[PDB]
């Protein structure tokens, strides 16, 4: 089946340069206008650049004109997006699409998507997150507060593993200062309050941080 | 050209006939397209000029109208078919998209568990206080969450985070933060987290005091 893989993606700083790559398989780029698009955090799709057959048209949405280049090489079958001057509105989720139907035709849909690279532009420095415990007061709470840490993504699990039951790790908030924060919750019985212990175990790999954190009432 | 999609959240069970519209700010004859996206997967495109069948895909879909009304319908929604969808309109060398409708898995009402947490005394020493409420297990998605200190409404110091739909039972969870300096922290008591949804009859409050 036709495939198309995005690559180059990553962290940049705001005002900063990255370039985007997208190769494919079981196809050749030649005979088609080729799309880039992005999903911004809504999660709605939003068309950035196309380039036509030959390099011959090269269009751009309003918000990205002048900032972003878009090119191919129909011979290595490549099709790139040169960003310079980023802003952190620049942060998505960008997919490579080809402009296609069966019988190829002057105005086809985007017939042909690769599965998307993370673009993220910050003005923050990598940093290992500050681990707070959310100490509970039938049914009880409590909890891990995974505060002020960059880059995405961090882990989280309870009791090495051994409590999965009741678990919800919140999906993370970029905060004002340009710092993700997010809690990780379970869900125990009052009367296991005092008895049982409850450890949370915090993982953000990219500064290389591992927390244990026992949570008790205060 | 501005598309707008409606509704933005349909929620529905397996066997239901739905309709999502994407309306066009002017026409567009029938240049439309409508592809189905999956949470961190690729779009898949379903129907092009506003009604065409993408071959391999199920006759369930089916797209209808034209110029600035557009309809994608499901006959018969089956599990496979929770997921985004987007409209398009597409020209030789460009292309807008609408917003995106996400159709849900529609379950019986259930009312969130209330729960409530004081910052810890660690994080006072960094200048600043996350006072956390959670609502646990709850459908439907809308919930609204009130924060208090001192019998006054706050606003615009909190943040929310909602959980994706559980694929056991099919409900979600959510966490409400409400972050204050040390200083507003410790010149009020009570703090306090008030909760509506459908599944409730009476607001739900949970509270604590500062210093116990
Ligand atoms: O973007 C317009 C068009 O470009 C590509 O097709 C080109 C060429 O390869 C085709 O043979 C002729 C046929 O009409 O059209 C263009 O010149 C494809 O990307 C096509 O899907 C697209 O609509």
């Known amino acids: 089946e036709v495939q198309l893989v995005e690559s180059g993606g990553g962290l940049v700083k705001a005002g900063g340069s990255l370039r985007l790559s997208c190769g494919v398989s079981?196809?050749?780029?030649?005979?088609?206008?080729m799309n880039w698009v992005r999903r911004v955090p809504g999660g709605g799709l939003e068309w950035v650049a196309s380039?036509?057959?030959?390099?011959?048209?090269?269009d751009y949405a309003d918000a990205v004109k002048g900032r972003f280049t878009v090119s191919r090489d129909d011979l290595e079958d490549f099709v790139y997006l040169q960003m310079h001057k980023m802003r952190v509105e620049d942060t998505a989720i960008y997919y490579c699409?080809?402009?296609?139907?069966?019988?190829?035709?002057?105005?086809?849909?985007?017939?042909?998507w690769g599965p998307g690279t993370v673009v993220t532009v910050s003005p923050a420095s990598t940093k290992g997150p500050s681990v707070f415990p959310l100490a509970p007061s039938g049914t009880a709470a409590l909890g891990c507060l995974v505060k002020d840490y960059f880059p995405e993504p961090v882990t989280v699990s309870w009791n090495s593993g051994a409590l999965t039951s009741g678990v919800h790790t919140f999906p993370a908030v970029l905060q004002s200062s340009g710092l993700y924060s997010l809690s990780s919750v379970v869900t125990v019985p009052s009367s296991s309050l005092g008895t049982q212990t409850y450890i949370c175990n915090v993982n953000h790999k990219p500064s290389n941080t591992k927390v244990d954190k026992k949570v008790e009432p205060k | 050209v501005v598309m707008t999609q409606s509704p933005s959240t349909l929620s529905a069970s397996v066997g239901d006939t739905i309709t999502i519209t994407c309306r066009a700010s002017?026409?567009?004859?029938?240049?439309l397209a409508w592809y189905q996206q999956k949470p961190g997967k690729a779009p898949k495109l379903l129907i092009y000029?506003?009604?065409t069948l993408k071959t391999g895909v199920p006759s369930r879909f089916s797209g209808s109208g034209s110029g600035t009304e557009f309809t994608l319908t499901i006959s018969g929604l089956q599990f496979d078919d929770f997921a985004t969808y987007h409209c398009?309109?597409?020209?030789?060398?460009?292309?807008?998209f609408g917003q995106g409708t996400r159709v849900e898995i529609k379950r019986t009402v259930a009312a969130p568990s209330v729960f409530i947490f004081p910052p810890s005394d660690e994080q006072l020493k960094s200048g600043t206080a996350s006072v956390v409420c959670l609502l646990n297990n709850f459908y439907p998605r809308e919930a609204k969450v009130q924060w208090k200190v001192d019998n006054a409404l706050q606003s615009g110091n909190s943040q929310e985070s909602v959980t994706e739909q559980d694929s056991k039972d099919s409900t979600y969870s959510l966490s409400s933060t409400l972050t204050l300096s040390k200083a507003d922290y410790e010149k009020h008591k009570v703090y306090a987290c008030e909760v509506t949804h459908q599944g409730l009859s009476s607001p739900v409050t949970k509270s604590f005091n500062r210093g116990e």
């Open positions: 699409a080809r402009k296609g139907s069966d019988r190829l035709s002057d105005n086809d849909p985007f017939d042909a």
């Open positions: 079981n196809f050749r780029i030649s005979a088609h206008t």
């Open positions: 380039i036509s057959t030959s390099s011959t048209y090269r």
């Open positions: 002017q026409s567009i004859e029938t240049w």
């Open positions: 000029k506003a009604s």
């Open positions: 398009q309109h597409y020209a030789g060398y460009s292309a807008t």
